[model samples]
Target chain A: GSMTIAENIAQLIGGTPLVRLRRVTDGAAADVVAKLESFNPAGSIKDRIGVAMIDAAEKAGLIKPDTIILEPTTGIALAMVSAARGYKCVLTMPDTMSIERRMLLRAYGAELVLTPGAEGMAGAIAKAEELAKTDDRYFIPNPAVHAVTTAEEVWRDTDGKVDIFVSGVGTGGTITGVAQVIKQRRPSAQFVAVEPAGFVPPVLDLALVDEVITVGNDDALELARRMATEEGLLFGISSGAAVWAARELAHRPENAGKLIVVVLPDFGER
Target chain B: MTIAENIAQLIGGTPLVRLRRVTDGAAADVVAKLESFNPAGSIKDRIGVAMIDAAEKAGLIKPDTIILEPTSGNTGIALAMVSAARGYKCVLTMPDTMSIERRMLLRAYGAELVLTPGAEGMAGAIAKAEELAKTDDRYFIPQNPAVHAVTTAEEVWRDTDGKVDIFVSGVGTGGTITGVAQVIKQRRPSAQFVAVEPDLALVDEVITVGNDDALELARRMATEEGLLFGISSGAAVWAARELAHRPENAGKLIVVVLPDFGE
Candidate 1:
C-alpha cells in the first residue's frame, strides 16, 4: 500500500490545500484565500523545500547521510532537511528571534550559532558560508542567493499539481527556483512574489510571475496578529505574509483560473 | 511600529512592574521583572542562546557541528528551534512526560527527538542525554541550573538600572536563588536573595509552591484587589516582602527578577 521510502517522501512534497479569507477582504472587489502550507509535518511548507534540497543533492551524488548542511536562520525547512536526513545542521542566528524557536530547535536537535543582537538573517548566512568554506564535510547551500540544488526537488514534488504558487521571498530560493519549473511545465501556471518593500530583489527576471505585490512588513505582521487573535490561523510572521499575498492573488477578478496556493515556511512560536 | 517588526523585536527590553494587587495585608511590597519578551520567549532563552554562543566562542562546537541535549521541556525546545535556524544538528532527549505539542514543535523545526522514560522526570532525561553525549561525538551541557540562575540575576541587575536589593525565585535546585544571590551580592554586596520553594515535599508544586504560588497569589490579588497581572505572577510579592523586613534591606528599592518558568 506504500511506495519506496524515497518515492513516498517525494509524494509527500506538494499539492497543498487552500483556504479562503472572509474578513481579510472586508471591502475588496475580489475573494481572498490563504494557501495554508503550515500543515506540513515540520510545521511549515519549507519542509518540502528542505527535503527537496537534500534529496536533489542525493540524486546528484552531491551529498549523503553523513554530510553536514548549514543554513542562515533557523529556517523551518532547513531544520526539516537535517532532521529527516540526519545531516548535521548549523544556523547562525540573532540573539532575538523567539524563545519558542530556540527551544524548538534544541528539542529537535540542532546546533545554534548566535550573532550580535542587531545583526539580522544576513549575518547568519555569512557565518554559515564561512564554515562551509573551511570544512570539507560542511555544506552551506545558501537558500537566499542560490537554491540551485533544492529547486529541482520542489519541481519534482509539486509536479502536475498546484495552479498558482503563492509564497513570500525570504532567501528567494523557494520562489525563484520553484517558480521557473512550475511555469515551464504548465505554461499557464502563475507565480506571485509577495515581498515586503525592499526585501524583494530587483533582478528576479522571470515571466512566469503574473505580478509582484508589496505587503509591507507592518501590514503583513498585522495580518499575523488578526490571524492569531481573531481567525486562529496563528503562524510565524513569514507564513502570515505568504497568506496575505495568496488572499490578494486569489480574490482578484483575473485570478479565478486555478488553485491559488501559498507557501508556509514555518509555524509561529507557541 | 508595525506588528510584524514589533513581534520580531519583541524579544528583549521588557520592563519591571510592581505587584500592586497582591500586597494587601502583607508586610511589604513585591515587584517582578518581566523577561518573557526575551527574543526567544522564556527567561532561559537568555542562557540557551548564550550558552551555545559562549560554547562556540570557546571553540567547542564548530560550524555544522552535531549537538545533543536532554529536554522535552523549554530549554531543549529553545535550543532545537534556535539551532535549526542557525545551522546545527540537535538531538533532543524528550521526557516521556512531555506533550505532543512539544514533539510537534521540535519536529517542525527538524530536530530529532529521543524519548526517555517519563517516570524519571528531568533526571532520567538528563541521564539518557548524558549517555548519548558520552557514546556519540556530541556535546551536552550538564544541568547547570546555575547558568540560568546567573542569567536571571544579571538581567535584573542591568535591566533595573542596578537597583536590585533582594532577588527571589522558587528554589527547586536552588540555582536561581543561589546564582542571583551570588551575582548580585558581588555587584551591590548588599542585595539580598530569596527563593519561594515548596513548604512541603511532593505537594503538587506546580499548583502550590515554587513559582506557581507566586503566580497564583499575584493573579488572585490582581482580581480581588483591583490589580492586573501578567498572569500567574506571585514571586514578586514574596521577594518584595523578604526585602522589606531586613533592617539593612529596608528602603533599598527591592527588585524581584521574575522567571517566566511558570505557566
Candidate 2:
C-alpha cells in the first residue's frame, strides 16, 4: 500500500519479502519461508554486500570516486553498486560463465576480462591478481566482506523469530553473516549450509554451521524447476539447494512448530 | 511490510527512482518506476491479476475455464504466471517473431502457445485469439486499461504529490496511455502525456521510436544508471529525454514507466 521514492538504485537494495511456501511444504510440521533476494534491484543477494563493503571502505578513507574496483568471476553486485555510485569497475570471468551473464555484467559498465574456462574461478582470480600487481593497488573485495548488513537483514526481516537459517555455501557470505546474527539473538537457533556434492567450501566457519547438506547439481536444478512450476518461485540453482535442506529439517519431528527461513539468492536466469 | 503467503501477494508497490546520471543535462527531474521488480516481471503483471480477478468476481470463468489472450511479450507471460498460481488453464496467441526466451517462459508456466505466422504479425495473433473466443469453452481475456487508470495512475499521482508535469509510456494498444491519461489529465490538466510508439508500426503527443533508438537508451541506462529495461521502457525513457530537452519544459518532472527488463 506504500510507494517508495528513492534518490538512486542503491537506496533500494534490501528489505526483500519473506514468502511462505504452502504447497511445496505441505508435509512439513513447521512453517517454511524463503527470503526472496531476487527483489533486489540488481536481482541478487550480493547487492547488500556490495553496497556495505564500499560504504565501509569509503568510511575508512580508502576509496575515491575514480578508484578502480576489481573482482573475479562476476560477483555482479559490486559492478552494479559501482555503476550506481559512479565508480570504475573491472571484473574478470572464466569462459564457463554464460554469455547472458557476461553481457549483463558488461551492461552494468564493468570491464570484463575473460579467462580460461578449464580453470574455473581460479582463472578469473589469477587475472584479477595480475591486473592488481600492475596497477595502483586496485580494490579487491572479499566474498565475506558482505557480512554486516546481510546479517542485520536476516535478523530484522524475520523479526528475530527465524528459528533456523539456511543458505548456500558459494562464497559463504550469506550463511556466515546470518549465523552470527541468529546465534546472538537465539543461541538455540539452527544454522544449515548447502553445497553442491563433491565441492568443498574454502572460508566457511564450520563452528557456526550446525549441518552441511550436500545436493547434486542435477537434484538442485530439478527442485528449482519444481519451485517454479508448483510454488511459482523461479529462483536460482543454489536457492533450490537451500530449500531442499530447509524442507528436510521441517520434516523432522524435532523441528515441529519452528519457522525456517531459507535464503533464495537470485532469479532463475539460465 | 508483511510476510507474503504466496508469490501473488508480491505484485505492485514498485520503487520510483530518480535518474541522476542519465538526466545530467536536463533541468527536469526524471523519475522512473521500476516495474521489472514485479513477480512475473513486468507492469503487465498488474493487468494479469486484475483481469483474472475481475473475471472471477463477474462469474465469467469457471473452475476449468481456459484463460486466453493475444500477446507476444510481457502480458502473455504475466497471464500464464497468474493462471498457474490461481489454478486456471491458460492459452496465449503470439507471433513467431517473439524471442525463444519468451516462448520458453510461457511454456514453462504451462501455458498453451498458439504460434501465428511471422508474416501475419500481431494481426494474425489477434485474429487467432478471436477465433478461439468464438468457442463457448475458452474465456477470452480482454485488455482492461481501467485497472491502470485506477491503480497505476493514482500511484504516480500520489507518489509525485500531483506535481508530475509529464507522463511517458509506450502505447500498448492505446489502453495504457488512454487509461493513465484519464486520471492524470483530469487531476493535473496541465500535465502532458507523451506516448512512444513503434516506428515499424499518442498524447500531449506522439514520438515514433525505432528499434535502434530504444536499444541505445536501454543499453546506456544499464551502464549509466544501473537500470536494465526492455525496449518499450527504453522507448518511454527516450521520449522523456526528448521532452526534457525542450526549452519550454526544462524544469518539469517527468515520470517514465519501465515495463520490464531486457532478456
Candidate 3:
C-alpha cells in the first residue's frame, strides 16, 4: 500500500547510490562519478527494470502471478522482485554467467535453467523464448534486452539531475536509450560508450554515443581498485570502464563548461 | 545510487516473512522474518542506521562525533559497522561476561573497547555508558526507553496489520516489549500479551513487561498480562508453554520473538 514511483523507482528505492569514481580516473585528470545501481533493493539495475517489465507484462494481460517469468543469469533483483511480488520466476542463464549468480538466485528461491557459457546471454534468451513457447504461461520481457526501458526509468527517476553520461556497452541498451533521451532534451549533452577490447554486445548503439573506447580486462580491474580506494567508491569491471570513459570526457577540451553524468551500468555482487 | 558501488549498497528495509517452521501453536501460525542477513547483520541494522541518521539529522551528532553504547551484543556490532562506514569513531562498553566472539566482532568493526564485570551483567555496562556520556560529549543513543518512540518498532507494528494476538519478545533492556506493547495496545486493545524474561537476571519483572504486580489491571482491560522468562532461552520456552496451556490461546495466533544468540 505504501508503494509509489518516487519511493520505489527513485529517492533511494533501488538502493543505488551515486558515488564519485575519482580514484580509477586519477591519471586522466577529470572529475568522475559512478551511479552504483547494484545497490537496488534486489541488487543491480535489473531490479527496477525487472519490476517495471513484469508490471508492464501484467498490465498488458500477457502474464499472471502463476505464469513463470523467466530471465537468464544471476540478476538478484529479478529473483528478488519476483519473490517479493509473488511471481513464479525462473532464471534461464548460460553456465557462463558465473557460479555465484546461480547460487544467489537459489538463495532468492528462483527456478534455474542453465544454458551454455560460450553462447552467453544470447543462448539464455533463446532458451527462455523456447520455454515460453513450450509452456503456454511463460513470458520473456523484450527479448532479454534490458537497457532501453532501464535507461528510461533512470531518466524518469533522475529527471534532470544527470549530465554527460558514461556506461559500458555490454547490452548497448544503457548508452543508446539513456543518452538518446538526454540528447533529445538537451542537445549538447555528451555520452561516452565503453566496451572491453575486441568485445561486442547487441545492446550497444554506435550513433547514440559521442565517443566509444576499448578497455582491457586487467586494466579495468586495476582501475576498479583505485576507484574504491581513492574515490570512496567500489566498482566492478563495467563500472571501471564507465569511470575511464567519464574521465576521458571530462578532460576533453570542448566539453569543459558542461556538467557530466555517468551511468555505472551495474555493480557486480561480490 | 552510487555509480558502480555494489558491496556497500546492501542495507535497509529487510523483508518481513512468515515464520512458518517456528510458529508451532495458536489460532494462526506466527511469522517473524529474520533481519540478521543484512550486510551488517542483526535486526539492529534498522536501528543502527535509523538512529544514527536521526541523531545526525537532529544535530546531535556530526561526522566527527564519537559514538558510544552499552550493549549486551548485537547493538555494539550494528553501531560499529554503521559508524565505521560513515566515518565516525565508535566506543562500546559491554559486560565481560559475553562470549569472546562478541568482543572480537565489535573490535573487528573498528570500535574502541570498554569492558565491565560479567557478574554485574547489563547493569554494569549501563553504568559505564552513563558515566562516559556524563563526562564526554560523545553522542549517546539510549535505547528508545519508551516503545512508541522508535520508528522501527512502529514499522513492525504496522507489518502486523495493527492486530496482535499475543505480542511476544525476549526482554533485554525491555525495548522490544515496551515499544511493541505500546503500539499493539493502542491499536488492538483486546490483545493479550506476554513479555519473556530470563530468570537469572533478577530483572524488575513487575516493572518490565508484566503491567501489574496484581492481576486486576489486566482483568479490567479484558486481557491477561504475565511475564514468563528464564535463562538461556528459558523465556522463549516459557512463552511457548504458556501459550500451549491456555485454552483461549490454543487456537489463536501467537508470535514468540526470540533474542538473537548474538554468537
Q: Which one wins by TM-score: 1 or 3?
A: 3
Worst 10 residues of 3 chain A by lDDT: A3-12
Model 3: per-residue Cα lDDT over B178-262, one tens digit each: 6656656666677655655433222212213232321222121111111111232333434444565567665554444423221
lDDT of 3 at A51: 70
Number of the top TM-score candidate: 2
Residue A36 in candidate 3, Cα distance off native in Å: 3.7
| Candidate number achieving the greatest lDDT relative to the actual structure | 2
True contacts kept of 2: 0.55
Q: Rate residue A217 of model 1 by lDDT.
A: 69
Ranking of candidates on DockQ, top first: 2, 3, 1
Over B1-263, each residue of candidate 1 has an lDDT whose tens digit, in order, gives 01111122223344555554344434444456655434344565555666676788787887857768777566765676556545566788867888998787666556788888888887887888788777866565533335656666656766566766556555533244555666777788766555444423211112234555665765453333222233334554554554556565545555554443432
Q: Write the per-residue lDDT of candidate 1 for residues A27-119, one digit (tens) a residue.
A: 455433444344343444556656766766778877866676777672655654454444667766877778888765654446788877666
Global CA lDDT computed for model 3? 0.56
lDDT of each: 0.56, 0.77, 0.56
Q: Indicate the residue-level lDDT of A5 in model 1.
A: 17
lDDT of 2 by residue, B1-263 (tens): 24887777788878789887776578787899877788876777887788887888888887878888889778788788877777677888999999999888888777889999999999999999888888766575665347745787878877887888998877674376678787787888898887777621127677887766888888878887788777877777877887888889978999988762223
Query: lDDT score, residue A114, model 3?
Result: 87
